[PDB]
Protein backbone atom coordinates (compact mmCIF):
# COMPACT_ATOMS: atom_id res chain seq x y z
CA UNK A 1 0.00 0.00 0.00
CA UNK A 2 1.61 3.91 -1.25
CA UNK A 3 0.23 7.11 -0.04
CA UNK A 4 2.26 8.54 2.72
CA UNK A 5 5.32 8.25 -0.05
CA UNK A 6 3.03 8.94 -3.41
CA UNK A 7 2.15 12.30 -1.02
CA UNK A 8 5.80 12.83 0.06
CA UNK A 9 7.03 12.74 -3.86
CA UNK A 10 4.15 15.00 -4.62
CA UNK A 11 5.23 17.44 -1.85
CA UNK A 12 8.91 17.68 -2.89
CA UNK A 13 7.64 19.43 -6.30
CA UNK A 14 6.00 22.03 -3.74
CA UNK A 15 9.32 22.30 -1.55
CA UNK A 16 9.98 25.71 -3.05
CA UNK A 17 7.06 27.82 -1.31
CA UNK A 18 5.53 28.14 2.31
CA UNK A 19 7.65 26.61 5.17
CA UNK A 20 10.42 26.59 2.97
CA UNK A 21 9.68 30.18 1.82
CA UNK A 22 11.09 31.00 5.86
CA UNK A 23 14.35 29.78 4.43
CA UNK A 24 14.38 32.25 1.53
CA UNK A 25 12.45 35.19 3.83
CA UNK A 26 14.78 34.95 6.53
CA UNK A 27 17.97 34.83 3.82
CA UNK A 28 17.50 38.36 2.70
CA UNK A 29 16.73 39.00 6.35
CA UNK A 30 20.29 38.26 7.12
CA UNK A 31 23.56 40.26 5.30
CA UNK A 32 21.12 43.26 5.00
CA UNK A 33 19.85 45.12 7.99
CA UNK A 34 16.86 42.30 9.86
Not at 24 to 29: E, G
Request: aromatic letters at 6%.
Amino acid sequence: SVSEIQLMHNLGKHLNSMERVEWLRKKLQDVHNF
